[PDB]
Design a protein around this nucleic acid. Structure first.
Lengths: 160, 49, 98, 62, 49
DNA sequence: GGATGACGATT
DNA sequence: CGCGGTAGCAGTAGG
DNA sequence: GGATGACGATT
DNA sequence: CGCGGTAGCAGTAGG
């Protein structure tokens, strides 16, 4: 945010380039974290529907307090609005809403399977991501923009 | 200087950037008239001008 | 509306990264967005302020990407020249920065 | 109530087989407005008003 | 006649009525500037003027 | 005794 | 930131 | 060789 | 529907 007079176009271009690179590394890292969090969320939802199916866990009746206790005594982590977990035991600590909140639908085998699929897919994402460098992702975005840009030029020439 | 001179990184003056941020907040894949988009953006971007 | 190409330049994935300005007890647009290619060179700018002024001409995106690749590969950059979309004229350099 | 008394089980049992049970127990359908249907799409309504409800409901307090 | 002369029952000209209908659609218990409310209403009431 | 203007939603 | 033009009707006021 | 104007976000 | 005023800088053009 410090006003600056550039002496060459390539100076500008460079000073952009570096920051961008850094934020591609940063981007990849964040996406990684978020993804891991998602995988944990899904996983625990599955453990929760599964433990209910096998009849190992019962929510029918049993005042929400007694349920919470069971949940945190089974290892279930809490989740805040963002999606960040908590295992320490309000927005700071997260709630079990990610598991009692889910529509009764989930408890039907079909929804269960969909959930599983979603989990697997999430993990696949995570793995594909960790297998890329900043410059890689940046490159992908670049080529995509190449296609999109060609199409754009076509359209622009078309309307004039 | 802030409102007239753009930032080297995106090349935006704060107005423009507020406009785009607004267009991202809303799903602008379907058109709407300018005289509405402007006020919308102004509202959801704290635009005092 | 949004050009189909806009969300290709300003990638959504980077949104969580930017530091969003806090104004009037409420969150507002980021300090700056970080496009996959400098836009300030794509469109340029004109502006008059106090003490400072600014003019930056448009440049051909393709060139910009070429140089970005160059840097990505530790290669020497090519020099660029003002370029306008759909313009059918000619431009000749006379002095560096002219 | 029918779920608590264990007279009705939704755990597993593909949604079709559940729907059948529901309409064979007399349960009416409900469209978006809130209008019922007992005849047996927006015209006929769905059982969403009963499988849709948050698992929370199934706690004595709810 | 339609846009200038009000209806006996509420005493509204279609513009006014669109404004109020708009203020009912949105929860206008908290203020906002006119230059925004107008475009909003126009958008959600099919106002072509 | 004819002319000009106020009012208001729209260009 | 700010100013101006026009329609359309009924009745009032100004020379 | 001094003056006027273009450009642009805001009053 | 439409028109107009002012700041602020760098450089170009007009007389």
């Amino acid at each position: 945010g410090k006003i600056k007079k550039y002496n060459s176009v390539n100076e500008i271009l460079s000073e952009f380039y570096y920051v961008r690179l850094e934020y591609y590394q940063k981007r990849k890292d964040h996406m990684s974290e978020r993804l891991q969090w998602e995988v944990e969320k899904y996983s625990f939802q599955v453990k929760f529907i599964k433990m209910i199916i096998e009849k190992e866990l019962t929510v029918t009746n049993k005042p929400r307090n007694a349920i919470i206790q069971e949940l945190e005594n089974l290892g279930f982590p809490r989740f805040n609005k963002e999606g960040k977990p908590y295992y320490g035991s309000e927005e700071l600590y997260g709630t079990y809403e990610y598991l009692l909140g889910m529509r009764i639908w989930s408890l039907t085998k079909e929804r269960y399977q969909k959930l599983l699929k979603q989990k697997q897919e999430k993990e696949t994402e995570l793995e594909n991501l960790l297998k890329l460098s900043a410059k890689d992702i940046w490159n992908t975005d670049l080529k995509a923009f190449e296609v999109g840009y060609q199409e754009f030029l076509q359209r622009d020439a078309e309307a004039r | 200087n802030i409102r007239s001179i753009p930032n080297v990184l995106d090349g935006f003056k704060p107005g423009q950037r507020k406009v785009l941020y607004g267009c991202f907040k809303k799903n602008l894949k379907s058109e709407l008239k300018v005289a509405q988009l402007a006020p919308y953006v102004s509202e959801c971007t704290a635009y005092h001008h | 509306e949004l050009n189909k190409l806009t969300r290709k330049i300003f990638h959504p994935a980077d949104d969580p990264l930017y530091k969003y300005i806090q104004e009037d007890e409420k969150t507002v647009e980021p300090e700056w967005y970080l496009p996959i290619l400098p836009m300030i060179l794509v469109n340029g700018a004109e502006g008059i302020g106090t003490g400072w002024s600014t003019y930056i001409p448009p440049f051909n995106p393709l060139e910009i990407i070429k140089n970005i690749r160059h840097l990505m590969n530790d290669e020497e950059l090519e020099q660029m020249h003002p370029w306008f979309r759909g313009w059918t004229g000619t431009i000749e350099e006379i002095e560096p920065l002219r």
